[PDB]
């Protein structure tokens, strides 16, 4: 299956030869501003091959039908982002914001705060590092593991902000299995987090728990998902990437985080898609 | 949606008063030895309210049609169980065998090796304990918990034995994937990790590499999967719990191995059927 | 498959020996008048067993959960027309009626305008006769077929009025498709028409032309869709019953036509759904 | 949604200007003898734009990979021609052939017998006629029609051989419902037909019935489906398209009975994969 997303439907098609990959995003809404620079700057951020743009806007705006684009098995890298980009599009349009960057390298892990991860330095970086305090190793490590003709694993550290709530589909289509889907299915990844994560295991309800009864949300353990429905705090996301399997990738996760980017992105536009109808008056609404 | 699975959809119906849950399981195959005693075992296991099944099997073997099941918002974990259990009756057929139990709780984390958990022990263990030296912190850390009016997280562990190669839709719909999506979904869980895990990240290719040039795999760091298709070795799945957010459940991590087990299982059962016309020759044989 | 629909799924499960039938409708926004009379009346015209509402309810309104419901291979028809019931009442909250007819029994076929079939007496008729000039004879030709231990096919005619403009997923999901797909698979059925239908086949684009111009439209040869989506129109929607392959049935495109008119329900209320998010505009209206 | 089927999934993106359209046909098993020239003929049948496979095959042979293919809102029809061309190879693996050709053309209908019309002479015909008597008159009422700047509608005829038997997942994927779904769904079509059709709804039990009870099937009056599954019997589908709404398409029900086929093709390419992990049996003998 090349197809991804419910409402939100992203298809990706191979070339052989690999002269140029492509993807088609089917059910985005009419009327949307198409920032086609915010499109190819991102396909800049990958491994760093330009964007044509074949349907689905008309006059820089989404005309509501598929959006055929095509970049010169395939490296479905490229059409992955190709398509986040696109669905951050509509992301913009409610303010929601998705942002990853490089937290750890190999032995070097940045033991900072979630919430204090350097974004502002992580645009900057060459390898979008997220603590200034071990870019300089990360670096080095990458660096290391590529002249001794070898890899190294990563770290990546997705937050979305300006999160909306109710945003996921209970049951069988909660917003932390599509991510964990959509953030897993990337290549090398082998670990996913949200929020407190694996440590969350070691805690006692009494230091998990998130109150608030009063305006919004105290602490954010859960990551900004409860019961598989997003509750308005920021998401905390966490996907761990192999050891690639000067040439070749010494660091696959780099690029990877830009993916892991586009991924969320493809999610969040989808279940707000899928949310639309969750309520008569929002539909009456809809329809006037 | 309460509806999961490609082929093999599995959907849980509530029932107000909360005097009994449903599940129905389409895509079953027809010609398959109904065990309703391994069913009826499972959903003792979990929080440990008879099952009955309505449809969908005639004479001891499945008739092809959907199961429906009844056992006396819902508390979908018993229709996970049922339904996972039926799955697994196709996963017999094939020698596919699907194990879980608690490694960690609390601070006490079992430091064992993967393949050195004691399942034999697990399941005679009141919480399915993988390392008997452990057994009785984690029964003191669960007490405990529940006298201070409090709970605890838990982590735990799924083995997949008799693996079969290619279980697996690349792309979009990769068994890791999968198992991320139907892992994460499960209540309380906020990590999963496949294989070494987030550890992989902090590892070099020459150490995560797993090779064989002759007959089997030699390592198996990437936990059973590869390309987001099985390669034959077991399955390496981890599962953390949350703690839940004497009465109540001290430490949901305990009846949540049950259910990421019946999960795994449902996943597994669906790339089977999935992976079933891939090839021309597989199809000509099917229609003889 | 025992599911239905894109967005309005809905599933029926079946019950050996007969005792009672199931459905679950899936996708019903929350906050929707649940009028469980209207329900229990419809059942009452196929054949013509209580339903008994397990949840998707509370105090009269939708929750937006999955509705249960149950009814004392299964007989289908039952549930088809449960579910549909539940659609019609999102269906109503846009005052979009559906209503059908028998117009056609054996060799007696009521040759009436379209827009001339008297739906009054529909209601009231033992066999929901559309034309009252042929009532006796529908009746005489049934009778007939019975006594002679023999069936006879039926033609059904399907109104649905207070139609939206829009209805209908373009290119492979259009709402002539679903139409078409639902009627096919209703029992006994070898035949659809849209409007003129096979007629439209020996016109001129000169006489089937439906134009306006200035307010709505003029003619509506189209049957209430062009494109795949519908125009406003009211919908003109033909369903032929082949004769049942005194006792058993003699002719079950009565019966049919109850059930035509459910699954025209469960699609329309379907693609309401889904055109719910088809505008940007929509969509922030939806998020207020 | 521009994919269609359930297994085999067709997808069709456009390209402003009308440069080109492209198809994506996703779940081809692999090892498939590619005929690319049957694919080059098939589109040079619609108004008789070469077209270029971008992936899925490899040496001759499908790859089991999406298989990208570029013809030179989008006129879909070329690309619903090109995948169906690909899914009638999988069907030539198991002897199905798909065919079908204009019987009526405006007031002038053909009143031969189904298995009557003349394919041989249809294939050599420009305009697919069934009925050599009235090949004449067809090609004079075109023209006809054209030069009156108008158009005409026709009755197109799909007749499919070799077929297999099961071919159709029962309840809400039938084989009928499938191919009424798709072929509704092309343009101009207004009414679809199965076997006996329309005329079934006059009919009695004992004229309809088609039995057996020693080798194969008596009479053909259902079509070729019975209860929503292929009984072995050849497929009577009649699609009838209205006219079109020199230059411009005075008949495009000519063009259409080449989608018409196509579009036959993919839902009988679908329920064939669909159809392969039915019987346990089968599944076995696919792995081995």
């Given at each position: 299956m090349n197809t991804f997303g419910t409402r939100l439907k992203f298809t990706s098609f191979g070339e052989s030869h690999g002269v140029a990959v492509g993807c088609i995003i089917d059910g985005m809404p009419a009327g949307v501003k198409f920032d086609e620079e915010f499109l190819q700057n991102e396909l800049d951020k990958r491994k760093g091959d330009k964007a044509q743009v074949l349907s689905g806007v008309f006059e820089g705006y989404t005309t509501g039908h598929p959006i055929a684009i095509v970049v010169f098995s395939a490296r479905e890298s490229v059409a992955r982002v190709a398509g986040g980009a696109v669905a951050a599009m509509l992301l913009r349009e409610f303010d929601?914001?998705?942002?990853?960057?490089?937290?750890?390298?190999?032995?070097?892990?940045?033991?900072?705060?979630?919430?204090?991860?350097?974004?502002?330095?992580?645009?900057?970086?060459?390898?979008?590092?997220?603590?200034?305090?071990?870019?300089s190793d990360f670096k080095?490590?990458?660096?290391?593991?590529?002249?001794?003709?070898?890899?190294?694993?990563?770290?990546?550290?997705?937050?979305?902000?300006?999160?909306?709530?109710?945003?996921?589909?209970?049951?069988?289509?909660?917003?932390?299995?599509?991510?964990?889907?959509?953030?897993?299915?990337?290549?090398?990844?082998?670990?996913v987090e949200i929020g407190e994560g694996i440590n969350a295991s070691k805690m006692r309800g009494?230091?998990?728990?998130?109150?608030?009864?009063?305006?919004?949300?105290?602490?954010?353990?859960?990551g900004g998902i409860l019961g598989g429905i997003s509750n308005g705090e920021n998401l905390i996301l966490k996907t761990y990437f192999k050891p690639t399997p000067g040439r070749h990738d010494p660091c696959?996760?780099?690029?990877?985080?830009?993916?892991?980017?586009?991924?969320?992105?493809?999610?969040?536009?989808?279940?707000?898609?899928?949310?639309?109808?969750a309520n008569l008056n929002n539909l009456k609404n809809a329809y006037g």
């Open positions: 929601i914001c998705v942002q990853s960057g490089v937290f750890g390298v190999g032995t070097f892990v940045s033991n900072l705060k979630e919430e204090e991860f350097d974004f502002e330095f992580a645009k900057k970086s060459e390898i979008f590092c997220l603590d200034p305090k071990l870019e080095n490590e990458i660096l290391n593991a590529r002249n001794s003709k070898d890899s190294v694993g990563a770290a990546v550290f997705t937050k979305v902000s300006g999160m909306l709530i109710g945003l996921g589909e209970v049951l069988y289509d909660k917003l932390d299995s599509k991510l964990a889907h959509a953030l897993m299915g990337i290549n090398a990844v082998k670990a009494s230091c998990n728990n998130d109150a608030l009864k009063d305006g919004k949300f105290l602490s954010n353990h859960s696959v996760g780099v690029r990877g985080s830009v993916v892991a980017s586009a991924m969320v992105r493809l999610v969040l536009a989808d279940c707000l898609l899928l949310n639309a109808s």
